[PDB]
Amino acid sequence: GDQRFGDLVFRQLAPNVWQHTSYLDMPGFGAVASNGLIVRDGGRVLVVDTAWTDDQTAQILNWIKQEINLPVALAVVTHAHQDKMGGMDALHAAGIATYANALSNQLAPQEGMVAAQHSLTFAANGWVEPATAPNFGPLKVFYPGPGHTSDNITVGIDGTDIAFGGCLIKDSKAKSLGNLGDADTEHYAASARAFGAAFPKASMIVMSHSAPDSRAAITHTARMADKLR
């Protein structure tokens, strides 16, 4: 069951995998939830995405200390928007090694974000260049193409049925594709489908702005995105 911890919510999804959820009261929209992941890999913890703020991200680290009590070896963040990278300073203050798409790091200052310490680069087929993601353990990083943003990346978790679409994917009942301000409308549908094709065995799709869903999240997202082009 959901665990309320301060102003955040944590949900166990699998052995060794939890979803973190944080909220930003954005004037004109409401209080917007954003989800990321926490993965235990043996004697260390790996984080996917910050919370919206430094204070909230420090609370994620406090929850990890309380509930897992192992060091956080690294974090990977999935594009240069506040819901995914707003808490980078808190990660750095904690001594955690941070990673983002090279393009996210390039974009970070202009987006009002602090860059990660390390840049991921990607092969033409979308898989991360392995030398740029050292010690990622079960995290399998894939660039599906431009969609929600030009820089959006995705993460599969080996040893589980889980793949994380970040803000690219919406659930199977969503009425819209959410924040398209920085979107690539031409390529969105193909990028959503490429995410699915990269992680064909994933039966639980985790995403930023919906609760976990089946692979119908991918097909529905792509079908909605067909209407953008």
CB of 81 to ligand [O-], least distance (A): 4
CB of 135 to ligand [O-], least distance (A): 27
Q: What string marks each residue from 163 to 182 as x (binds Zn ion by CB under 5 A) or -?
A: ----x---------------
DSSP string, 11-71: EEEETTEEEEEEEEEETTTEEEEEEEEEEEETTEEEEES--SSHHHHHHHHHHHHHHT-S-
Sites of contact with ligand [O-] (CB under 6 A): 81, 83, 167, 179
192: three-class secondary structure by DSSP:
helix
Q: Binding site for substrate: what residues are annotated?
A: 170, 179
Q: Binding site: what residues are annotated?
A: 79, 81, 83, 148, 167, 170, 179, 209
Contact (CB, 8 A) for 100 and 116: yes
In this structure, what DSSP letter does residue 132 have? Answer: G
Q: What string marks each residue from 184 to 223 as x (binds Zn ion by CB under 5 A) or -?
A: ------------------------x---------------
> Is the CB of 45 or the CB of 207 nearer to ligand [O-]?
207
Judged by CB under 5 A, the residue of 81, 170, 187, 220 near Zn ion is 81
Please work out the total of residues on this chain that contact Zn ion, with binding judged by CB under 5 A.
Answer: 4
Residue 97's DSSP bridge partners are: 74
Q: Angle formed by the axes of helices 216-226 and 188-198, to 10°?
A: 160
